[PDB]
C-alpha cells in the first residue's frame, strides 16, 4: 500500500512572485507547477498538495514577439453573434489580472479539483497586497541547470 495524503495533514505555504519583465508562458507554467504541488513529493492527484501563491504587479507582464498587439483572448456571451473580441493591449488596459488568471486557468486540471486549486491563486495589479499577515516567502523561479 503506497502513500496517499490525508485531509488536514496536508500542509500549505505562501509565496509571492513579482511578474515584472517575466515571460508570460514561463511564469504561468512555474506558477501552475507550484500551485498543483508537483514540486512537493506528497503529490497525489485526488487531493491537492499545492501552496497559496500570490502574484504582484501583474500589469508589467511581458510577452515575446509582437504578441502585444496580435494575441486574441476570446469568449462568447451566450447568444447568437455574441462573440467577444479582445487583445492583450486592451486586456491589460482595462483589466490586467485577467491575463495571468486565464493563462493559469488554462493550465490547471480542468476538472473540479483544478477548479478548486484555482482558488488558492491570487493576482494583483500594483506592487502591494492586503495579504501581508500571512508572511509570504519570496519565490523567484529558477531552473535546474543541465
Amino acid at each position: 500500500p503506497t502513500y496517499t495524503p490525508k485531509a488536514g495533514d496536508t500542509t500549505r505555504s505562501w509565496y509571492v512572485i513579482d511578474a515584472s519583465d517575466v515571460v508570460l508562458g514561463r511564469l504561468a507554467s512555474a506558477a501552475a507547477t507550484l500551485l498543483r504541488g508537483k514540486h512537493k513529493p506528497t503529490f497525489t492527484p485526488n487531493v491537492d498538495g499545492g501552496d497559496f501563491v500570490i502574484v504582484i504587479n501583474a500589469d508589467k507582464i511581458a510577452v515575446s514577439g509582437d504578441k502585444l498587439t496580435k494575441k486574441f483572448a476570446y469568449r462568447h456571451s451566450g447568444y447568437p453573434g455574441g462573440l467577444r473580441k479582445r487583445t492583450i493591449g486592451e486586456l491589460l488596459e482595462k483589466h490586467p489580472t485577467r491575463v495571468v488568471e486565464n493563462a493559469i486557468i488554462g493550465m490547471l486540471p480542468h476538472n473540479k479539483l483544478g477548479r478548486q486549486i484555482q482558488k488558492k491563486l491570487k493576482v494583483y495589479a500594483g506592487p502591494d497586497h492586503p495579504h501581508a499577515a500571512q508572511q509570504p516567502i519570496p519565490f523567484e523561479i529558477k531552473q535546474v541547470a543541465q
Binding site: 508537483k38 514540486h39 513529493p41 535546474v144
Partner: peptide, 13 residues
C-alpha cells in the same frame, strides 16, 4: 513523486 523529490533535492528524475 520521484521527480518531485529529485527536483527538491536539486536533480532531475
Amino acid at each position: 513523486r520521484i521527480n518531485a523529490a529529485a527536483r527538491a533535492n536539486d536533480i532531475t528524475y
